[PDB]
Ligand binder design. Structure first.
Ligand SMILES: [Ru+3]
Length: 124
């Protein structure tokens, strides 16, 4: 079974690329990472930093989660990320996305032991 930690890595980690490679990055990634299996996931973010760096965020700046929980953390340093947003013309199963590269602080929710990232809350 896929753990919460593994799911976070599948849905949000992409250390291979340094930034939003091409304009079709999201179209390929959202599909390959199985985010368009049962439907077109509305929005999703991929982080282009090492796994260690992202996991380290769980010990960085503690901030409130969007859902009101207190287990969210903001990276002290900005990180290379790619935001994927479904286009208005997108129609399942042919999910279409707009790829946007950026450098911002990420906010992730952490849980468990080891205390690791399990949800991507936001970027600021
Ligand atoms: Ru800043």
């Amino acid at each position: 079974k896929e753990t919460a930690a593994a799911k976070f890595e599948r849905q949000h980690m992409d250390s291979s690329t340094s930034a939003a490679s091409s304009s079709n990055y999201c179209n390929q990634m959202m599909k390959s990472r199985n985010l368009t299996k049962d439907r077109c996931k509305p929005v999703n973010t991929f982080v282009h930093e090492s796994l260690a760096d992202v996991q380290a965020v769980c010990s960085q700046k503690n901030v409130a989660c969007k859902n009101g929980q207190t287990n969210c953390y903001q990276s002290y340093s900005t990180m290379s990320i790619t935001d994927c947003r479904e286009t208005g013309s997108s129609k399942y199963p042919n999910c279409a996305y707009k790829t946007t590269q950026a450098n911002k602080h990420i906010i992730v929710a952490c849980e468990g032991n080891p205390y690791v990232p399990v949800h991507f809350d936001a970027s600021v």
